[PDB]
Structure 1
Amino acid sequence: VNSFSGYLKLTDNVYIKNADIVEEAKKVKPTVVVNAANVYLKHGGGVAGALNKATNNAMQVESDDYIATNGPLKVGGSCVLSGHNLAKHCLHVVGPNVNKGEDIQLLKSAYENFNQHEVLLAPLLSAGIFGADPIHSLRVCVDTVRTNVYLAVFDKNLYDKLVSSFL
């Protein structure tokens, strides 16, 4: 039993809700929140910009030190950093950005990072400003993640379509 509330169950391990991931994290304080990161951990917009803003830019400061030490992530890769005031940890995961021409097959690799954590709060990878089809992203999530994932979808209209079209 966990403290996630109001989710629709899609499969044994995948749950979904129309919610602002920032507000969800602040309420639940999960062990792991997933950020929709880029390889430079530049948290300018989308989910990343919103999460970073909620940390008063502490996420960005920590991220800049991480990059200075380690260099950029790989598309499809991840790193674990602090969750600041939002969660114990933040798993920064880089899905392919279609508006950069990146290979959508890397979306499965991106979701595989979730399997290293027993329970996560997460957005749909490569959705929003990363330009992929969110219906496809949900399909890949369900077919790749085996640990317990709670998906927050900000847009109510998109949430209803993902549910109604879910196979």
Structure 2
Amino acid sequence: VNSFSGYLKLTDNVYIKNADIVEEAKKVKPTVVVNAANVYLKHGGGVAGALNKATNNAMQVESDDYIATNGPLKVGGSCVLSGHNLAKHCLHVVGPNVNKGEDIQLLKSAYENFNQHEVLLAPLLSAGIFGADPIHSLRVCVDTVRTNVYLAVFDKNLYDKLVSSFL
């Protein structure tokens, strides 16, 4: 039993909800919140910009120190950093950005990072400003993640499409 509320069960381990991941994280304080990161951890917009704003820019400060020490992530890769006031940990995961021309086949590799954590709150990787088809991303999530994933979907219209079209 966990604290997530109001989710629709898609499979044994994948759940979905129309919700703001920022407000959801603040309420649940999950062990792991997933950020839709880029390889430079520049949290300027989309989910990353929103998560970082909620931390009063502390996420960005921590991220800049991480990059200065370690260099950029790989597309498809991840790192674990602090969750600040939102969660215990933030798993920064780099899905391919279609608007940069990156291989969508890397979306599966990106979702594989979720399997290192028993329970996560997360967005659809590569959705939104990353330009991928969210129906394809939900499909990859369901077919790749084996741990318990709670998806927050910001747009009410997109969610209903995701639920109504889910196989």
Shorter-chain TM-score: which interval? over 0.9
Note the aligned Cα RMSD (angstroms): 0.1
Q: CA–CA distance in 2 between the matches of 1:93 and 1:109?
A: 10
Q: Within the alignment, does 1:124 sit opposite 2:142 as a pair?
A: no
Report Cα offsets for 1:18-51 as digits up to 9, x if no partner.
0000000000000000000000000000000000
SS in structure 1 at match of 2:72: coil
1:7 to partner: Cα distance: 0.1
Match of 2:142 in 1: 142
Deviation at 1:79, TM superposition (A): 0.0
Q: CA separation in 1, counterparts of 2:130 and 2:8?
A: 25
State the Cα distance separating 1:59 from its structure 2 match. 0.0
Residue 114 of structure 1 deviates from its aligned partner by: 0.0
Query: What TM-score do the two structures reach when normalised by structure 2?
Result: 1.00
Secondary structure at 1:34 match in 2: strand
Count of residue pairs the alignment pairs up: 167
TM-score for the superposition, normalised by structure 1: 1.00
Q: Tell me the equivalent position of 2:49.
A: 49
What is the rounded CA distance, in whole Å, between the counterparts of 2:95 and 2:89 in structure 1? 19
Partner SS, residue 69 of structure 2: helix
Q: Which structure 1 residue ranges, 5 or more long, are not aligned? A: none
User: What secondary structure, in the 3-state scheme, does the structure 2 residue paired with 1:99 have?
Assistant: helix
2:56 is the counterpart of 1:60: no
Deviation at 1:93, TM superposition (A): 0.0
**Where do 4+ consecutive residues of structure 1 move more than 4 Å?**
none
Alpha-carbon distance in structure 2 between the residues aligned to 1:135 and 1:56: 32
Deviation at 1:101, TM superposition (A): 0.1
Q: Which string of whole-angstrom CA distances, capped at 9 and with x for unpartnered residues, describes residues 70-107 of structure 1? A: 00000000000000000000000000000000000000
**Per-residue Cα deviation, 1:94-149 (whole angstroms, up to 9, x for no partner):** 00000000000000000000000000000000000000000000000000000000
Q: How many angstroms apart in 2 are the aligned matches of 1:154 and 1:133?
A: 15
| Secondary structure in 1 matching 2:80 | strand
Quick one: distance in 2 between partners of 1:3 and 1:68?
Answer: 36
Quote the Cα distance in structure 1 between the aligned partners of 2:36 and 2:88: 17
Which ranges of structure 2 fall in alignment gaps of 5 or more residues? none
Q: Percent sequence identity over matched residues?
A: 100
CA distance in 2, matches of 1:14, 1:24: 17
